Amino acid sequence: AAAAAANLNAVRETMDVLLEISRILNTGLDMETLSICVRLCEQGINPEALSSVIKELRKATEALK
């Protein structure tokens, strides 16, 4: 398939758009993890729950520093 891979290039293009959005906002997230988050909202999820998850997980790496 050829059109099914140009859509994957399209996914990477929006992923770089969200890369610029992540740096101007100063988030710690990288590209692989945001693709995991994209799949999470494919199944449907509260962003308020994902932010509480990540707002526990990042400042539970500051408790073993």
């Binding site: 293009e13 959005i21 945001l34 999470l40 909202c41 999820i45 308020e48 509480s52």
Partner: protein, 99 residues
């Protein structure tokens, strides 16, 4: 991919641990994520975009405020994002001033 298993990849990305190493963080993740697996309303990415503009206003980047309307358009242009509201709410919730 299951709802349950994608959070262990979230745990393997933030922490340097596997799902077979830590189960205490992943437990609170399953507790919070599950039973709250439904978005609060249908999409309003425009309302969240006008608050991401308020973050770009806080830095006297008004040329990047004019870039944001063309960056917010590409999300709709490819259409691979189902909840454009959720990921913008998620980024906006983690907003810190570069400052």
């Amino acid at each position: 991919k299951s709802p349950n298993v994608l959070l262990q990849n979230l745990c393997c990305r933030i922490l340097g641990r596997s799902e077979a190493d830590v189960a205490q963080q992943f437990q609170y993740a399953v507790r919070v994520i599950g039973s709250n697996f439904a978005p609060t309303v249908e999409r309003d990415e425009f309302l969240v975009a006008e608050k991401i503009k308020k973050e770009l206003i806080r830095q006297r980047r008004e040329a990047d405020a004019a870039l944001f309307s063309e960056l917010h358009r590409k999300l709709h242009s490819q259409g691979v994002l189902k909840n454009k509201w959720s990921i913008l709410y998620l980024l906006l919730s983690l907003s810190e001033d570069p400052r």
